[PDB]
């Protein structure tokens, strides 16, 4: 029932058995009650997918030699015409904000109208163009792998935010510096993350 | 745990409302407070929170003063707020009101758990039912007791007695901190080193305060 | 002296400031804050006092020896009615609407003619 | 305690408490707002 | 039952315990909703205040957001009337206020008439033939031409969910407009500028930092700084 | 049984009377280890304090003895942090502090999880597969990678003799590091220098001469 277990030998969770991607966890007992646990499941999958999109939007523009991710939305301050993948979209920040608000409002309104809890978790159909998870065991394995990569991308996005709050240097340059100088380039060397070095 | 228990004064009659069930019940009550069960519950909760805050503050003061005497650049426990908001990114006004906003939730949850026991643990706060339920009057438990050595009743009683005794000791320690910092204008660790350096001379009678000197003869 | 000036206060022939009491005239010359706003505030507070006293009079009469409650005040009840009087005009006009604010002339102690 | 509380619940004691409360409120208002006459925000 | 509790561990009022009206949380500490007709009038007044608050907050934020973004050039809400009344084609302030008062007098008189007698505005032949759908389905929910898209013609569970969403966004909007007035009086700037100030510098731009909101805290701040 | 008495003629505590563990001498005037769970916690804490004190006294004495023999140029322990922070390959103090904190937090978390439930780290596949051999045979003595050369599968008498030797040398190391701290706070020199001065002049190398140790004794010393 448990894919894994952090801190092996911990107290077993009688309320987290059939959950996909379950590594026991929750020492704060936040997963009690079925409705709250289901709502937290929806929040966890949605936040993992949004962390996927954020990590994609960071790393794809970082490794393509187009700039960092902090200066990417700064053109609204500058007013210079944006560029995406060399397609050179002429849209304006007022129109962009309006269409984004309308589109995400109607999309999340449609998502909130899922009736069934499992359909709110994984609807399929139009959202599954090929559907490799037709097999139930393959479905469970894909759900576990999606949750694992989502948690890893969540940690990556939090690291992006913290690193770019500490220093303006890009995270791929941070990885290069940690490879070149591990013991002389880390969060303790900045002195801002932890006071008193 | 009652009846023939050590009291605040040997031979004094213990109060009727102080049967010895509470932790640290030495039958000490000259003013006959906490006679009513609700007043007793309020006094127990107030003593527990004052004890916890006193122990936390005295431990922080002692750690900062010990580090300052060792060589770390730490200010004295008195007037530490001045240099604190001189170097704080958060100025005064915003910091104290942010602290009040952060404290209001915990304080009102404590108050309405004291008034209504077990009412907080009903899924109202982020869907928590088993947790956030007060095990005793002033002893909530739950997520505030992550490791469960309070599950045993005798161990829980001994922990309660130890906690209330160390709390009263820290109350007197904080009062002593205030008094001998107003008297000597030095750190409590400085007073300790002065007392263990010349015990026969350095005391509460040679500071020029506490005992007044008028004739000087 | 600086605050009395540049605040709409006016004085006649003696330097002692004068207050305009007629509404409308005080509204079109920015003198409403002299007496118009304070009189409304005092009416609000006086209605608070009256509503709290009425609530304590009514709520301490359906019990044995109401004079004992009158002479020895129920402090938690008094404080509860104190903190529940913030909406005195709403409750007052609602009691007027349902007729419980006023007593009929048949249950009222009356002097002989 | 409850007998002393009912003594404090008597009318002169609660009237005294109201007197100190109202007097202190008005005095602190007058002290921190020195001599106002007209409501001007 | 009840949607939630505004104050956990506190006893709910008796009139609010078994009540099933949407947007209920037991928040009657002053016990004003004890009477049923008074509760109905309070619910209708809350609906009206909330709806006009949502309209006002939208008209403050969305044009304000577009102006701070740069596409729009409409003024901020706290001076828009003054600059508009200075226009060369401006309708006079008295004329606009009188027309607003007359139109709102007609509308609120119709609302009063359908409140004091429910469904009484459907009297035949009283408003150009189109008075048939001018009836009150519920307290504060007339329907008909007020619901031309037919979104309210849904199962009662979804209708109750929509009512809960309406009253919650409404209460948020009244709190938001109270904030608009309050920290316009405090900061003297637009709400979008205040949001940008709080985002850029959260600690230094706080309601306790300025002395307008909390008088005397600034004196304590300079006392501690000295 | 018991390995002896800390004080002959003194009555053994009831919880220390009929127990079975290494290094038992009845030394508990305060009866702190009355609770068996508290006794296990105190035993584990004493074991880890003794082990880190053994490492401390080893790194203080053996490089110090090599320095006194002229083989090495290792400085004293009370300035070695300042020596390393000023070196050419000076890793910053913060980086080393956080690395040590993270590694020791992981180690202490694993040890605490093994202490709360004995043998609970032997669940299959949690830690690279080999964690099935991480089961703690005794509280504080897991074995396995901790003893790869194989001195644990000996006779039980040999096992308790080795445990008693470990406890005795550990307690000696703890009092040795307490002496190192006291001698640095009073004499201000290295422990090897103190030992050399005690060998050269036993009477002059005494803490009675130092006024930091016994205040007022030097007053009597110069009074005569
Ligand atoms: C737990 C309660 C508490 C106590 C007993 C103290 C104690 C003290 N504070 Mg600290 N503080 C407390 C509240 C808090 N203070 C501060 C932050 C400050 C500052 C910034 C200042 C002190 C000040 C002082 C001094 C008051 C001198 C006085 O009143 O003489 C009459 C003294 C060292 C003052 C100080 O340090 O000067 C002596 C001062 O200006 N306090 C914060 C966080 C914002 C508090 C939170 O509750
Ligand atoms: C780590 C990546 C990952 C993985 C393994 C899955 C896996 C799954 N999701 Mg999910 N999904 C993801 C990310 C991921 N998702 C993200 C980021 C979003 C938001 C855009 C969604 C949105 C989403 C919806 C809305 C639905 C699913 C569904 C599914 C299932 C379909 C399985 C299948 O046919 O393809 C197997 C999976 C793969 C082959 C992964 C390929 C990923 C490519 C390589 C990423 C390329 C990115 C590129 C470099 C830029 C399965 C459980 C459906 C479901 O379970 O319904 C029953 C469903 O309804 N997912
Ligand atoms: C609009 C009316 C209103 C008012 C005045 C309050 C006021 C309060 N609520 Mg409440 N609350 C409200 C609506 C309201 N709430 C709604 C609509 C919900 C959703 C059901 C909640 C859910 C809620 C929870 C879950 C909790 C509070 C709590 C609190 C207290 C926090 C005290 C503090 O320092 O906060 C700053 C305070 C008395 C806390 C409390 O009192 O705990 C006992 C708490 O835990 N509230
Ligand atoms: C009965 C008491 C009383 C008296 C003697 C006055 C007297 C006055 N009022 Mg006032 N007034 C009163 C009560 C009173 N007011 C009340 C209760 C209100 C409603 C809040 C008003 C609202 C009012 C307005 C709106 C105006 C006056 C004006 C006036 C002036 C001329 C009135 C007129 O007919 O010409 C005069 C100084 C007018 C004024 O200032 O002079 C042009 C004016 O515009 N009054
Ligand atoms: C009944 C007539 C009357 C009226 C209308 C006033 C009205 C006023 N007097 Mg006066 N006064 C009166 C009788 C009266 N007083 C009497 C009988 C005495 C002698 C005991 C005094 C002695 C007196 C002194 C010595 C002073 C005043 C002051 C004031 C001001 C109120 C300041 C205050 O309370 O803080 C304001 C408090 C509040 C607004 C309460 C707010 C509470 C909540 C928030 C509502 C105001 C202009 C003071 C002033 O500013 O002079 C102009 C002042 O210095 N008066
Ligand atoms: C000023 C407009 C206004 C009005 C008329 C109401 C009226 C009402 N609200 Mg509401 N409320 C408002 C603003 C308002 N609210 C705002 C701004 C908030 C957010 C801070 C709330 C938060 C709130 C909660 C959380 C709850 C109510 C409830 C109620 C009812 C209580 C009736 C009462 O005590 O007398 C009306 C009060 C006055 C006229 C003053 C009534 C339907 C309760 C309810 O639904 O019970 C029926 C309830 O649970 N309201
Ligand atoms: C409660 C509803 C409400 C109210 C009372 C107002 C009031 C006002 N708006 Mg409007 N407005 C609203 C909602 C509201 N707004 C909404 C929901 C939007 C769409 C987001 C707008 C969009 C809007 C624009 C685009 C403009 C106004 C303007 C104005 C002002 C002059 C009226 C005019 O010329 O109309 C028009 C006036 C202060 C004008 C103005 O002076 O700018 C602030 C103007 O140019 N409004
Ligand atoms: C008891 C002392 C006291 C006094 C006299 C005031 C007075 C005021 N405050 Mg303040 N306030 C106080 C304590 C006080 N406050 C405390 C303790 C807090 C923290 C909860 C606040 C939080 C606060 C906010 C958040 C706001 C005010 C605002 C206001 C104004 C509203 C009245 C008005 O202008 O009409 C006024 C200047 C409002 C303001 O700035 O008016 C424009 C406003 O937005 N106050
Ligand atoms: C922090 C966070 C959640 C944290 C949750 C925590 C700690 C949970 C706590 C607990 O588990 C613990 C610890 C232990 C348990 O005892 C208790 C619980 C309670 C179980 C979510 C953030 C979630 C954050 C999210 C989703 C952020 C998404 C951001 C996006 C998409 C941004 C877009 C852009 O990045 C692009 C794409 C390209 C760029 O150029 C431009 C921009 C605009 C910057
Ligand atoms: C002693 C004390 C109370 C004593 C009460 C007594 C004797 C009461 C006696 C009686 O009731 C009995 C028994 C029985 C009754 O019949 C009779 C009476 C007579 C009524 C409380 C102290 C209570 C003391 C407390 C709670 C201390 C808290 C300390 C904190 C929070 C410290 C915070 C700091 O801010 C500082 C101050 C300065 C910064 O430099 C550092 C930091 C850490 C920031």
């Amino acid at each position: 029932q448990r894919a894994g277990n952090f801190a092996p030998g911990s107290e077993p969770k009688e309320y987290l058995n059939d959950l996909p991607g379950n590594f026991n966890f929750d020492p704060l007992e936040l997963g009690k009650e079925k409705g709250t646990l289901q709502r937290y499941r929806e929040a966890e999958l949605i936040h993992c997918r949004w962390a996927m999109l954020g990590a994609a939007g960071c790393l794809a523009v970082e490794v393509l030699g187009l700039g960092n991710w902090y200066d990417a939305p700064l053109w609204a301050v500058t007013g210079d015409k944006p560029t995406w993948f060399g397609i050179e979209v002429p849209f304006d920040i007022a129109t962009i904000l309006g269409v984004e608000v309308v589109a995400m409002a109607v999309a999340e309104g449609l998502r909130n109208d899922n009736q069934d809890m499992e359909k709110r978790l994984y609807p399929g159909g139009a959202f599954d163009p090929l559907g490799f998870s037709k097999d139930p065991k393959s479905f469970e394995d894909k759900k576990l792998k999606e949750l694992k990569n989502g948690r890893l991308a969540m940690v990556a996005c939090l690291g992006f935010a913290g690193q770019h709050a500490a220093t303006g240097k890009p995270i791929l340059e941070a990885l290069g510096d940690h490879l070149s100088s591990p013991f002389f380039n880390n969060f303790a060397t900045n002195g801002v993350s932890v006071p008193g070095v | 745990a009652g009846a023939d228990r050590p009291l605040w004064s040997p031979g004094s009659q213990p109060p009727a409302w102080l049967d010895g069930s509470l932790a640290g019940d030495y039958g000490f009550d000259p003013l006959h407070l906490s006679e009513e069960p609700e007043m007793r519950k309020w006094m127990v909760q107030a003593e527990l929170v004052h004890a916890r805050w006193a122990m936390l503050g005295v431990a922080g003061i002692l750690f900062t003063s010990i580090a300052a005497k060792n060589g770390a650049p730490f200010p004295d426990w008195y007037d530490a707020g001045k240099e604190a908001i001189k170097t704080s990114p958060a100025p005064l006004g915003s910091l104290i009101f942010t602290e009040l906003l952060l404290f209001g939730w915990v304080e009102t949850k404590r108050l309405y758990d004291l008034r209504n026991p077990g009412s907080q643990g009903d899924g109202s706060f982020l869907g928590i039912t088993d947790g956030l339920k007060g095990k005793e009057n002033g002893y909530p438990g739950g997520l505030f007791d992550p490791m469960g050595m309070s599950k045993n009743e005798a161990s829980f009683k001994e922990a309660k007695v130890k906690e209330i005794k160390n709390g009263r000791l820290a109350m007197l320690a904080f009062v002593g901190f205030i008094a001998q910092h107003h008297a000597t204008h030095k750190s409590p660790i400085d007073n300790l080193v002065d007392h263990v350096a010349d015990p026969f001379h350095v005391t509460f009678a040679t500071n020029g305060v506490s005992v007044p000197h008028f004739t000087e003869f | 002296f600086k605050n009395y000036a540049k605040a709409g206060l006016l004085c006649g022939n003696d330097g002692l400031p004068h207050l305009i009491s007629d509404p409308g005239l005080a509204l079109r010359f920015n003198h409403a804050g002299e007496v118009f706003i304070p009189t409304f505030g005092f009416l609000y507070v006086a209605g608070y006092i009256g509503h709290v006293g009425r609530q304590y009079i009514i709520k301490s009469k359906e019990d044995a020896k109401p004079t004992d409650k009158e002479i020895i005040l129920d402090v938690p009840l008094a404080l509860q009615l104190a903190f529940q009087g913030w909406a005195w005009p709403l409750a007052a006009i609602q009691e007027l609407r349902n007729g419980s604010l006023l007593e009929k002339d048949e249950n009222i102690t009356v002097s002989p003619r | 305690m409850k007998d002393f509380t009912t003594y404090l619940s008597t009318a002169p004691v609660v009237g005294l408490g109201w007197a100190i409360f109202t007097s202190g409120l008005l005095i602190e208002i007058n002290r921190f707002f020195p001599d106002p006459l007209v409501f001007s925000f | 039952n009840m949607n939630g509790n505004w104050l956990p561990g506190s006893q709910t009022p008796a009139h609010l315990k078994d009540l099933k009206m949407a947007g209920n949380f037991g928040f009657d500490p002053l016990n004003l909703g004890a009477e049923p007709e008074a509760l109905r009038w309070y619910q209708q007044a809350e609906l009206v205040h909330s709806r006009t608050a949502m309209m006002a907050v939208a008209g403050i934020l969305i044009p304000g957001l577009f102006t701070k973004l740069g596409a729009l050039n409409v003024p901020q809400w706290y001076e828009a009337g003054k600059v508009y009344i200075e226009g060369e084609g401006a309708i006079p302030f008295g004329t606009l206020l009188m027309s607003t008062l007359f139109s709102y007098a007609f509308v609120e008189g119709k609302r009063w008439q359908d409140f004091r007698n429910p469904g009484s505005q459907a009297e035949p032949g009283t408003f150009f033939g189109l008075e048939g759908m001018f009836k009150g389905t519920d307290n504060g929910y007339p329907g008909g031409i007020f619901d031309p898209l037919g979104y309210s013609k849904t199962s009662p569970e979804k209708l109750d969910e929509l009512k809960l969403k309406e009253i919650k966004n409404g209460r948020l909007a009244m709190v938001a407009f109270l904030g608009f007035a309050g920290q316009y009086s405090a900061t003297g700037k637009g709400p979008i500028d205040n949001l940008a100030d709080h985002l850029a510098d959260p600690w230094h731009n706080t309601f306790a930092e300025n002395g307008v909101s909390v008088p005397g805290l600034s004196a304590v701040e300079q006392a501690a700084a000295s």
Side-chain angles (χ1 to χ4, degrees), chain A, chain B, chain C, chain D, chain E:
Chain A
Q1 38 96 44
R2 252 197 282 272
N5 192 94
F6 98 106
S10 59
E11 206 266 319
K13 254 31 158 175
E14 88 289 330
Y15 64 101
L16 307 168
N17 313 58
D18 312 59
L19 275 85
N22 180 37
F23 308 95
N24 201 76
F25 215 54
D26 199 17
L28 254 170
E29 312 309 306
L30 260 200
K32 301 315 278 301
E33 210 276 286
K34 192 54 228 84
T36 69
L37 182 54
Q38 232 286 331
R39 159 83 150 98
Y40 291 156
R41 264 140 67 82
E42 307 325 283
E44 188 179 57
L45 295 174
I46 292 312
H47 264 284
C48 273
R49 293 158 155 126
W50 278 94
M52 231 73 87
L53 298 325
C58 293
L59 79 96
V61 84
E62 270 217 349
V63 308
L64 257 51
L66 313 157
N68 214 343
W69 65 271
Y70 222 122
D71 36 47
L74 278 194
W75 68 269
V77 195
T78 77
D80 76 272
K81 137 74 154 61
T83 286
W84 184 76
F85 258 127
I87 321 280
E88 269 89 47
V89 281
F91 273 63
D92 182 45
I93 64 70
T95 76
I96 284 151
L97 202 79
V99 303
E100 178 188 348
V101 158
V102 167
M104 302 279 333
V106 67
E108 301 259 303
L110 286 156
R111 176 177 99 196
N112 210 2
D113 301 342
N114 256 283
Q115 287 48 12
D116 177 42
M117 285 345 302
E118 183 51 54
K119 298 307 273 271
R120 203 167 264 95
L121 250 200
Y122 303 94
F127 285 92
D128 224 342
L130 291 97
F132 309 124
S133 75
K134 286 319 124 163
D135 168 73
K137 173 248 156 201
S138 298
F139 185 39
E140 300 318 294
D141 189 25
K142 269 145 191 147
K143 275 183 297 191
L144 155 76
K145 295 202 247 233
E146 176 179 56
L147 215 35
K148 253 181 166 201
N149 283 251
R151 275 163 191 140
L152 171 78
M154 242 300 273
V155 176
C157 274
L158 205 33
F160 294 154
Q163 185 260 329
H164 212 332
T167 36
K169 159 266 295 283
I171 188 65
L172 90 164
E173 293 177 350
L175 170 62
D177 290 11
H178 182 52
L179 255 287
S180 78
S181 82
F183 312 100
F184 319 104
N185 179 269
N186 78 93
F187 78 106
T189 51
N190 318 133
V192 197
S193 313
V194 175
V197 50
Chain B
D4 37 358
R5 47 177 221 265
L7 287 203
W8 75 278
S9 156
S12 295
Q13 232 58 46
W17 52 97
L18 295 196
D19 60 332
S21 61
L22 323 160
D25 192 275
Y26 293 98
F28 187 39
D29 223 33
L31 280 191
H32 307 210
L33 291 143
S34 88
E35 279 198 58
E36 293 85 22
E38 52 268 43
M39 184 102 261
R40 204 160 330 122
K41 284 164 219 141
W42 179 269
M43 284 324 189
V44 157
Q45 259 264 19
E47 186 177 64
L48 257 300
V49 296
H50 264 110
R52 279 156 179 140
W53 286 121
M55 299 193 9
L56 274 185
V58 165
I61 281 159
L62 279 190
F63 185 77
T64 43
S65 190
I66 277 157
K69 251 266 172 78
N70 289 331
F74 275 168
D76 203 293
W77 86 267
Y78 222 107
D79 59 66
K82 309 293 262 285
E83 316 103 350
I85 45 58
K86 267 157 210 45
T87 194
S88 168
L92 211 67
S94 187
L95 184 51
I96 169 183
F97 273 35
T98 298
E99 147 192 338
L100 286 167
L101 259 65
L102 260 301
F103 259 77
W105 222 264
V106 194
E107 286 269 312
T108 194
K109 286 188 89 82
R110 178 168 66 83
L111 165 71
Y112 272 96
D113 188 75
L114 160 69
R115 286 178 60 185
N116 206 7
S119 57
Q120 305 295 325
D122 64 328
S124 59
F125 183 78
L126 307 182
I128 303 167
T129 80
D130 210 335
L132 308 186
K133 281 195 290 96
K135 151 169 287 175
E136 285 206 349
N137 177 217
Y139 303 95
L143 304 312
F144 312 104
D145 189 45
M147 22 208 88
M149 74 318 272
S150 63
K151 307 306 218 330
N152 180 270
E153 309 96 84
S155 292
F156 182 47
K157 171 199 271 309
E158 292 332 285
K160 284 187 309 234
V161 169
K162 272 156 238 190
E163 182 178 61
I164 192 68
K165 277 157 105 163
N166 287 252
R168 286 155 186 178
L169 186 58
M171 265 154 249
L172 287 209
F174 185 74
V175 158
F177 286 169
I178 296 205
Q180 65 208 217
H181 202 301
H182 268 189
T184 61
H185 301 279
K186 277 191 173 181
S187 100
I189 297 305
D190 293 15
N191 305 138
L192 181 68
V193 187
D194 290 345
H195 178 58
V196 306
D198 207 309
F200 291 165
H201 301 335
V202 193
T203 172
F204 93 109
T206 48
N207 46 4
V209 195
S210 71
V211 46
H213 284 18
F214 298 142
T215 170
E216 255 294 325
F217 141 81
Chain C
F1 267 91
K2 193 182 61 177
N3 287 332
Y4 285 179
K6 71 155 213 59
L9 279 183
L10 62 80
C11 52
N13 309 336
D14 38 44
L16 311 168
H18 284 189
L19 262 57
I20 309 301
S21 91
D22 168 67
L25 190 59
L27 294 172
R28 67 165 37 87
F29 284 100
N30 212 94
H31 301 140
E34 283 164 1
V35 282
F36 185 51
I37 294 169
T39 310
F40 265 21
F42 178 76
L43 279 196
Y44 164 80
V45 179
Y48 204 125
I49 309 310
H51 178 64
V52 161
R54 174 151 209 275
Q55 281 319 293
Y56 196 82
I57 280 295
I58 292 171
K59 277 192 178 182
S60 100
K61 260 166 155 172
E62 57 278 67
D63 41 350
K65 285 189 177 179
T67 62
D68 266 343
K69 300 298 294 309
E70 283 218 356
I71 191 182
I72 311 178
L73 290 201
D74 207 299
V75 187
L77 174 61
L79 263 297
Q80 158 195 349
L81 296 166
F83 290 123
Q84 277 176 346
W86 294 98
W88 80 264
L90 301 305
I93 68 111
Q94 259 311 114
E95 281 159 332
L96 184 74
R97 283 297 231 279
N98 53 63
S100 88
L101 183 63
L102 278 294
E103 213 157 58
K104 323 282 300 309
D105 283 53
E106 284 78 72
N107 290 302
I108 281 174
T109 281
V110 152
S111 173
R113 329 257 78 95
Chain D
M1 206 28 46
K2 78 169 300 308
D3 297 273
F4 183 72
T5 323
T6 45
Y7 165 74
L8 293 201
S9 310
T10 51
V13 184
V14 294
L16 190 57
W18 153 85
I20 295 100
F21 164 69
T22 315
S23 316
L25 176 63
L26 283 181
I27 279 160
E28 289 260 69
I29 281 167
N30 291 310
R31 162 154 86 90
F32 289 110
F33 304 101
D35 307 356
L37 177 74
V38 50
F39 174 75
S40 300
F41 151 75
Chain E
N1 283 339
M2 312 195 15
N3 300 325
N5 204 352
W6 76 285
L7 188 41
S10 76
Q11 324 98 349
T12 170
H15 43 274
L16 295 204
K17 173 196 309 300
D18 46 79
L19 203 64
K20 311 200 61 129
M21 142 162 53
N24 61 327
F25 299 102
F27 184 42
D28 207 341
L30 314 190
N31 318 113
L32 319 171
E35 267 59 48
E37 292 153 340
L39 182 84
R40 286 155 33 87
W41 175 274
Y42 286 155
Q43 150 203 43
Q44 197 124 17
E46 184 175 49
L47 280 192
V48 169
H49 262 86
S50 80
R51 278 154 202 210
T52 190
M54 293 133 90
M55 282 309 346
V57 161
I60 283 179
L61 283 185
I62 304 303
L65 267 171
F66 274 8
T67 316
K68 225 273 199 171
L69 277 188
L72 268 185
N73 213 27
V74 299
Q76 300 278 347
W77 62 274
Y78 42 89
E79 85 282 349
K82 205 151 246 215
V83 47
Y84 166 68
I85 214 68
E86 284 152 352
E88 85 288 332
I91 313 160
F93 155 74
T95 297
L96 285 164
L97 195 79
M98 281 330 81
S99 58
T100 296
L101 275 175
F102 289 157
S103 61
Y104 261 52
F106 208 95
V107 169
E108 296 252 38
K110 269 284 226 196
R111 220 175 41 85
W112 221 329
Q113 212 57 232
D114 61 60
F115 177 77
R116 63 209 312 255
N117 284 328
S120 58
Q121 302 330 100
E123 260 196 24
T126 194
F127 223 88
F128 316 125
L130 67 142
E131 72 273 303
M133 77 269 207
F134 272 137
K135 71 263 200 172
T137 62
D138 268 331
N139 211 51
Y141 310 103
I145 206 50
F146 296 92
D147 188 41
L149 262 67
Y151 278 2
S152 92
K153 324 200 164 52
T154 309
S155 47
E157 289 87 43
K158 270 234 214 295
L159 196 41
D160 213 18
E161 156 147 1
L162 277 150
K163 282 150 167 237
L164 180 58
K165 269 154 181 220
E166 182 170 40
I167 192 75
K168 281 214 200 123
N169 277 55
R171 285 157 183 192
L172 194 49
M174 323 177 23
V175 170
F177 188 82
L178 191 69
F180 290 162
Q183 64 247 46
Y184 152 70
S185 74
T187 70
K189 286 144 100 276
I192 310 300
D193 308 309
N194 293 327
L195 187 51
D197 266 321
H198 180 42
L199 275 185
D201 231 15
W203 289 114
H204 306 151
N205 302 57
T206 303
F207 76 105
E209 292 276 303
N210 56 84
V212 183
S213 90
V214 182
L217 208 41
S218 70
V220 184
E221 285 161 21
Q222 335 323 312
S226 67

